[PDB]
């Protein structure tokens, strides 16, 4: 449980509670995207999705999911937050109060990242006989290794250093489109379990850099030296270390305080800007003391602006169970076929529903045509009308499932929708036998048949079904992340 | 306006505000008889009925209308009250707090005293473009001189000493029923403006008595003498004087305090019980001082337990205006013909509505029969269906007024209900042509025609219409008042 909550799935990078937060949010702001306050939304959550814990951790994790700061664990804010949600400069955890700040669901992104139609398709866990969360979402991108995580967690320290964006764009556009030259070469690679394409950590809003040594990567920040004023200007840090913790860590080592004179903090979470005046003969005696090597100079040994980016990637598979990984390539391998199978189930279900709609509307317009021959206004039993409408060719229909085909398997969709009462022909007094309604129902049958033929085309798409849909959806997610990040999560 | 508010109508004995109170109460407790508190009900009043004053006088008059004490101005509680609404012993005005006591509408009486069906029939005053109160109610009894009123009011001191109950029962059962031997003799009397029947003031829960001198009655209370203890026990008062005001009025006259020793108050509003010990040789020296006459003895001069019942009866006629009276007989004369005219309008309106219902349901079952000949499923316009259903004999019906005939004159009821669309035949798909519905609609036509024949009988009732209805309704009011008085407005 504790391991099951604090180590995420390889499909979400999120807890069960985080998925509950998102599910309740989609349930909330669907009709109207007006910003709530935090506690109203939290009460909505704890009522609806059965948030099984206390509201302190609820409001905590909600504002954690609203942490929009450079170097957060979210490159993608789930919620547009209005207020004051934190600062990396002051350790990150300096948000506002749960009475002032406003959360709002960023549905203009979430409709694209999460397939809104396929929300029905997901294997839910209907506990307590009631509507509960996805067992796992499925995103358009593989989101579960696109964002950082650095926490004391169960079993292992949870550590997900990020990747790039366009590397995964290239990988997935490669795996889908056959217009890749490397397309079957990628299938060759996946078949042979070999790595062929660059898979680089993130670079967004981080002006330091990386190298590889051994297997590890080392990250470096920047500095400016001026022995005129005898001041070093620090402008760049390693990956996700707060400002105050760094300055206090500099004031830890009395061995290095032997030349540390004056530390002035001009920084913010917006801009890192630290001015450090040192003693006379600082740098030369540092060179005399600190062994300057290739991996760090005297300044990189002194100020300690490098980081070894060790990782821990041992996630939780669906249908119960923990799957333990070694590379990011394993994660992308595991991520692909579930999305493929989801598109397959998607278009098969849509094909079944289009079958049943065309069947029902044909039977209806057939009755409108046979208004003359039937004319059965000398009957007094409804089951009499059932039997006589079973004479002249009208099929038993359970139109309740026909109008809304909720949550079912495709087999039960075709079985138990055809076993109902004929009330759709029937209800009330006269005038709907008039032919203008007949005409518009025929127009509906024509559009449904054209859509059915488009479905039956896309059933046979190479090399797996629905691939052009997924190219369109990655195009939409590209539009979404461009609109978001290039406006930096303002959406205005 | 102040005269218009503080002098009532001769049909209500109530203010415009009191009629607003009753109207909002019927509007409130209609669906459910679950009691409010006072302030919720007052807010319901001030919102709905446009209560044109402040809530202090509102809660004041509401608890005034919940005053159930022997010697109130209400023999008939409009509202069942739960709490503690006052005491005659302490001057009457010692109610509870407006946020802890409960009012409840006594609809089981009010349905009988106020004709619930004829609530539609009343000439309303629809000001501000919206729903407002009756100009005047009409009760089954002449309520407006059945209950006391003793107040400093505009123009005159408002004074309505009560009558009996069964005197007015005899008067009105005489005016209606021709099985009275005095029936045409009463018509002789009303034609000749003479008084023929006893018209006595109230006696309920007043063990004193009355006599006539000149024109007035004088009312006498009781006393018990014991010169053993030299104590007089007062058990009965005059009509509606509080206990503490009486004892203080006894302690006013120092001329009589020359023998007043000790006044002990064992009384309540339930029971009057006052023990007065006097000085030795009180009564004999009182006889030596007070001139014992016929109209009062030495005790009735001393304790002053008599009352001259002067009156002021100058009420406010409807359609504007003040009508000024001389006798109760004038009031009963004015009261009769309006209720007569109300029954006439009542049964004429019901006759019009039964006409229109039988017309519509005959046209409907005619269409159900002519389903075969029409079969007009080869049309595409609704006005086409209008014209072709105007061919085969189906009348234009404004069914909106037909289903609910609100608030209209009978002429507009027959004019503008026949000028509408044929949508009652029409609006949806088919199955209501199945003839069990036809059968039950025929059953409806049969009961409507039988009820129409009963109406056309009662149109010709001697000597004025609806008189047997009014005998039934006075029987119901008799049942209600006996049921209440045996239960003391507890109704349990």
Author numbering:
A (entry chain A), B (entry chain B): 701 to 1192
Provide text from the study.
One intriguing example is the African swine fever virus, which stands as the sole mammalian-infecting virus encoding a type II topoisomerase. The ORF P1192R encodes a functional Topo II (pP1192R) which is highly conserved across diverse ASFV isolates. These structures have unveiled the inherent architecture of Topo II, which is characterized by two principal heart-shaped functional domains: the ATPase domain, responsible for ATP hydrolysis to fuel the molecular machinery, and the central domain, which interacts with the DNA duplex and contains a catalytic tyrosine residue that cleaves the DNA duplex. As a result, Topo II not only relaxes DNA supercoiling but also disentangles knots and catenates potentially detrimental to cellular function if left unresolved.
As indicated by our structural analyses, without DNA binding, the apo pP1192R undergoes dynamic conformational changes. Notably, three distinct apo conformations exist: pP1192RClose, pP1192RCoil-open and pP1192RWHD-open. A comparative analysis of the three apo central domain structures (pP1192RClose, pP1192RCoil-open and pP1192RWHD-open) reveals that notable conformational shifts are evident within these structures. Compared with pP1192RCoil-open and pP1192RClose, pP1192RWHD-open exhibits an apparent separation of ~26 Å between the WHD subdomains. Compared with pP1192RCD-DNA, two catalytic Y800 of pP1192RWHD-open also rotate by ~40° and the distance stretches to 32.6 Å.
